[PDB]
Symmetry: D2
Subunit: 49 residues, 4 copies
Amino acid sequence: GLLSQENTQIRDLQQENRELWISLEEHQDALELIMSKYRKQMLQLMVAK
Amino acid sequence: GLLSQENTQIRDLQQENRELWISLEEHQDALELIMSKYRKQMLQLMVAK
Amino acid sequence: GLLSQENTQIRDLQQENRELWISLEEHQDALELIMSKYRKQMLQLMVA
Amino acid sequence: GLLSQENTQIRDLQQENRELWISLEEHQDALELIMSKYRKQMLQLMVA
């Protein structure tokens, strides 16, 4: 009965779920990268001083 | 037949879906607020200069 | 001669430079905090 | 007397101050871009 309208909708919602999580995860990585670069620049300024 | 295991799972997945969206939306607001404050400070520095 | 043009302009540039450093670190703290909230929300969704 | 201690230290503080301003704006551009990508991803999910 995996082909029922309900089981098909479950798999569609699980795919949407996964896409939302990937969106959150990709932006978590972007936040970490920008913070890493921001703190590396603060250190480069201190070193040059 | 709204009480079937499948229909119950659909409503659970829709609630999860909504929670993921709220997580994305709340952080969109946080990003906007921090950028607004960041640009307002750059202007306050320019004005004081 | 601390009232020299030299020593006076030094003091103004030092004040501006201190304000720029404070601006950089205050924004650091603000981004760190929204990243903390973001990460902890993801951790909460993940075990729910 | 541009080689005065006054005028020399002025120039160093001006260079540092310019670097701090560039740092602030470069990070502005970087955050604006990740916010752009984030917002456009949400818009894409919303019409999908």
